[PDB]
């Protein structure tokens, strides 16, 4: 439901809150969430 990114091979995937925390293709134990889809605005100051 929510995307994730591996910490070594930078491979995108998704998890269903029941899979083991692991990259599907290289088996790394550290993954990162992906950026939000909301709008990000800055004041340029």
């Amino acid at each position: 439901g929510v995307k994730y990114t591996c910490g070594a091979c930078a491979h995108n995937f998704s998890l269903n809150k029941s899979d083991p925390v692991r990259c599907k293709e290289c088996g790394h134990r550290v993954i990162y969430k992906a950026r939000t889809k909301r709008m990000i605005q800055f004041d340029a100051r």
Partner: protein
């Protein structure tokens, strides 16, 4: 529950990068189980566990 806001959390209880946060906002959502009370009397599944 904490007096902050939980609306910035994702489905897995973790906030996502790129989201602006303020003081007292909830960035990690975690719950611990509690033995249920006698609320199963007439609560329609809406009892605190």
């Amino acid at each position: 529950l904490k007096h902050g806001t939980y609306e910035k959390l994702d489905e897995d209880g973790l906030i996502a990068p790129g989201v602006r946060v303020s003081g007292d906002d909830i960035i990690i959502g975690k719950t611990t189980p509690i033995p249920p009370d006698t609320e199963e009397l007439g609560q329609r599944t809406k009892y605190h566990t």
